[PDB]
Design a protein around this motif. Structure first.
Motif, short mmCIF file in Angstrom:
data_model
loop_
_atom_site.label_atom_id
_atom_site.label_comp_id
_atom_site.label_asym_id
_atom_site.label_seq_id
_atom_site.Cartn_x
_atom_site.Cartn_y
_atom_site.Cartn_z
N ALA A 97 0.64 -1.24 -0.10
CA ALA A 97 0.01 0.04 -0.13
C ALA A 97 0.96 1.16 -0.09
CB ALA A 97 -1.07 -0.14 1.25
N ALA A 98 0.84 2.15 1.05
CA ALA A 98 1.70 3.23 0.85
C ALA A 98 2.36 3.40 2.34
CB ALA A 98 0.74 4.55 0.87
N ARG A 99 3.12 4.31 2.82
CA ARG A 99 3.99 4.58 3.93
C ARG A 99 3.22 4.56 5.20
NH1 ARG A 99 8.49 2.29 5.86
NH2 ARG A 99 10.05 3.51 4.81
N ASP A 100 3.06 3.94 6.10
CA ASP A 100 2.50 4.05 7.24
C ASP A 100 3.20 4.95 8.42
OD1 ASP A 100 0.10 3.77 8.71
OD2 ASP A 100 0.48 1.81 9.34
N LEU A 101 2.61 5.25 9.47
CA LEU A 101 3.53 6.20 10.33
C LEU A 101 4.06 5.40 11.47
CD1 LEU A 101 3.82 9.08 11.34
CD2 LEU A 101 1.50 9.00 12.72
N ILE A 102 3.41 4.34 12.09
CA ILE A 102 4.20 3.43 12.93
C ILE A 102 5.17 2.59 12.41
CG2 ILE A 102 2.51 1.66 12.65
CD1 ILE A 102 4.12 2.48 16.11
N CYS A 103 5.17 2.33 10.97
CA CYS A 103 6.26 1.32 10.34
C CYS A 103 7.50 2.32 10.15
CB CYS A 103 5.56 1.03 9.25
SG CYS A 103 6.73 0.03 8.12
N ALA A 104 7.48 3.58 9.96
CA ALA A 104 8.55 4.61 10.06
C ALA A 104 9.03 4.86 11.19
CB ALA A 104 8.25 5.94 9.09
N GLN A 105 8.02 5.10 12.22
CA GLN A 105 8.67 5.12 13.66
C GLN A 105 9.28 3.75 14.21
OE1 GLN A 105 5.12 5.76 16.45
NE2 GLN A 105 4.59 7.54 14.82
N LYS A 106 9.05 2.59 13.85
CA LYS A 106 9.52 1.29 14.17
C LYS A 106 11.10 1.50 13.38
CE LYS A 106 8.73 -2.73 16.12
NZ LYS A 106 9.91 -3.33 15.91
N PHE A 107 11.11 1.83 12.08
CA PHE A 107 12.31 1.51 11.36
C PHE A 107 13.35 2.60 11.99
CE2 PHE A 107 10.01 0.18 7.23
CZ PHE A 107 10.04 -1.19 7.92
N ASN A 108 13.22 3.75 12.63
CA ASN A 108 14.26 4.48 13.33
C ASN A 108 14.59 4.11 14.89
OD1 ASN A 108 12.93 6.96 11.16
ND2 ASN A 108 15.19 6.35 11.08
N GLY A 109 14.32 2.86 15.42
CA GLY A 109 14.73 2.59 16.73
C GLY A 109 13.42 2.73 17.72
N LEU A 110 12.29 3.21 17.30
CA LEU A 110 11.25 3.49 18.37
C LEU A 110 10.36 2.35 18.43
CD1 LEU A 110 10.41 6.85 17.42
CD2 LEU A 110 12.43 6.46 18.53
N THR A 111 10.19 1.83 19.77
CA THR A 111 9.52 0.39 20.08
C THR A 111 8.53 0.58 20.84
OG1 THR A 111 11.37 -0.68 19.39
CG2 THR A 111 9.70 -2.20 20.28
N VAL A 112 7.37 0.24 20.72
CA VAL A 112 6.14 0.32 21.48
C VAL A 112 5.86 -0.95 22.18
CG1 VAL A 112 3.56 0.66 21.75
CG2 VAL A 112 4.85 2.38 20.56
N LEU A 113 5.89 -1.04 23.53
CA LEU A 113 5.65 -2.34 24.21
C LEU A 113 3.98 -2.65 24.56
CD1 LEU A 113 8.58 -1.93 26.81
CD2 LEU A 113 8.44 -2.96 24.37
N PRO A 114 3.66 -3.58 24.57
CA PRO A 114 2.21 -4.20 24.87
C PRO A 114 2.00 -3.94 26.04
CG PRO A 114 3.28 -5.99 24.64
CD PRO A 114 4.25 -5.18 24.21
N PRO A 115 0.89 -3.64 26.72
CA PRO A 115 0.31 -3.54 28.11
C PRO A 115 0.31 -4.87 28.57
CG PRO A 115 -1.44 -3.11 26.82
CD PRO A 115 -0.31 -2.97 25.94
N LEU A 116 0.55 -4.99 30.00
CA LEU A 116 0.78 -6.04 30.81
C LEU A 116 -0.65 -6.88 30.93
CD1 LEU A 116 2.13 -8.22 32.29
CD2 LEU A 116 1.98 -6.83 34.46
N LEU A 117 -1.98 -5.99 31.12
CA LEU A 117 -3.14 -6.63 31.01
C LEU A 117 -3.75 -6.37 29.78
CD1 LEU A 117 -3.93 -5.92 34.79
CD2 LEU A 117 -3.92 -8.04 33.97
N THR A 118 -4.50 -7.45 29.27
CA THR A 118 -5.17 -7.23 27.95
C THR A 118 -6.42 -6.38 28.21
OG1 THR A 118 -5.91 -9.51 27.97
CG2 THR A 118 -4.16 -9.13 26.87
N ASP A 119 -7.26 -6.31 27.44
CA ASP A 119 -8.39 -5.66 27.38
C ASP A 119 -9.61 -6.48 28.01
OD1 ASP A 119 -7.24 -3.27 26.40
OD2 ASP A 119 -8.15 -3.11 24.59
N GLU A 120 -9.48 -7.81 27.64
CA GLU A 120 -10.66 -8.73 28.22
C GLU A 120 -10.41 -8.84 29.72
OE1 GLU A 120 -8.72 -9.42 25.51
OE2 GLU A 120 -7.50 -11.36 25.90
N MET A 121 -8.80 -8.71 30.29
CA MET A 121 -8.74 -8.89 31.45
C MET A 121 -9.05 -7.73 32.39
SD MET A 121 -5.14 -11.00 31.85
CE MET A 121 -4.65 -11.93 30.61
#
Ligand SMILES: *[C@@H]1O[C@H](CO)[C@@H](O[C@@H]2O[C@H](CO)[C@@H](O)[C@H](O)[C@H]2NC(C)=O)[C@H](O)[C@H]1NC(C)=O
Ligand SMILES: *[C@@H]1O[C@H](CO)[C@@H](O)[C@H](O)[C@H]1NC(C)=O
Ligand SMILES: *[C@@H]1O[C@H](CO)[C@@H](O)[C@H](O)[C@H]1NC(C)=O
Lengths: 99, 105
Positions: free
Chosen positions: A1-25
């Motif tokens: 498709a086209a260039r995304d925003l989180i993907c260019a964020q990821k490619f420069n060394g910025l990583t988002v960690l998932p939360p410890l408790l999911t939404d169903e918990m």
């Protein structure tokens, strides 16, 4: 498709960690709190959960604010109708306004 | 001030802070009962003053909400309001009167 925003964020060394408790918990915790509050009252937050009918619990709640508990038992249907109308009003206000 | 019904608390010093010792009251051993909102006695609805109606299967009592202490249902600890046709779940039971044994004696 086209260039995304989180993907260019990821490619420069910025990583988002998932939360410890999911939404169903979190939803399970909220459902446990509702099932405690409706059934037992305030007794489940101070020890063992002790059951009580909801009309007698609401009579305790009216007796806590300085109104005699006979006002509930003579106006139970009106109070239930007012609570149901308020809940429906919150549902309609959340469905309509997005701000 | 602690998990439960708060009763009393104590401070204790510590390096770079303070330590509290919270004394609390928690209920221990419960048992099931059958309860009613009011009691219909010859066309009068009786509500408890400070308490809750309970039953041990056959007889009806009034007790505290946080400790099981049964008492005889009497006009001293109950007040009258209205009739028996408006309250949902009102039961049929008798209400003792304190003037009856002291009037004949
Ligand atoms: C419910 O409570 C009543 C009141 O305490 C109990 O009735 C008493 O039972 C004892 C034991 O049999 C007798 O010695 C008393 O004379 C009774 N008092 C009265 C006023 O009847 C009763 O046993 C309890 N249990 C049930 C199932 O009714
Ligand atoms: C009360 O009744 C329920 C179901 O009848 C039972 O599971 C429970 O053990 C009883 N006792 C208490 C103290 O809740
Ligand atoms: C209580 O008594 C009244 C009249 O004495 C009667 O009409 C009513 O049905 C009784 N309640 C029950 C649950 O039997």
């Amino acid at each position: 498709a086209a260039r995304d925003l989180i993907c260019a964020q990821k490619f420069n060394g910025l990583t988002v960690l998932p939360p410890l408790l999911t939404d169903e918990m979190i939803a399970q915790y909220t459902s446990a709190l509702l099932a405690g509050t409706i059934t037992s009252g305030w007794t489940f937050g101070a020890g063992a959960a002790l059951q009580i009918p909801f009309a007698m619990q609401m009579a305790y709640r009216f007796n806590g604010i300085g109104v005699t508990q006979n006002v509930l038992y003579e106006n139970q249907k009106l109070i239930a109708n007012q609570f149901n109308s308020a809940i429906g009003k919150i549902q309609d206000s959340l469905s309509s306004t997005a701000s | 001030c602690g998990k439960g019904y708060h009763l009393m608390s104590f401070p204790q010093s510590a390096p770079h802070g303070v330590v509290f010792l919270h004394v609390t009251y928690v209920p221990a051993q419960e048992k099931n009962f059958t309860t009613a909102p009011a009691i219909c006695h010859d066309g009068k609805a009786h509500f408890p003053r400070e308490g809750v109606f309970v039953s041990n299967g056959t007889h009806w009592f009034v007790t505290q909400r946080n400790f099981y202490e049964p008492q005889i249902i009497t006009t001293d600890n109950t007040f009258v309001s209205g009739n028996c046709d408006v309250v949902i779940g009102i039961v049929n039971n008798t209400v003792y009167d304190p003037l009856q044994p002291e009037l004949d004696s």
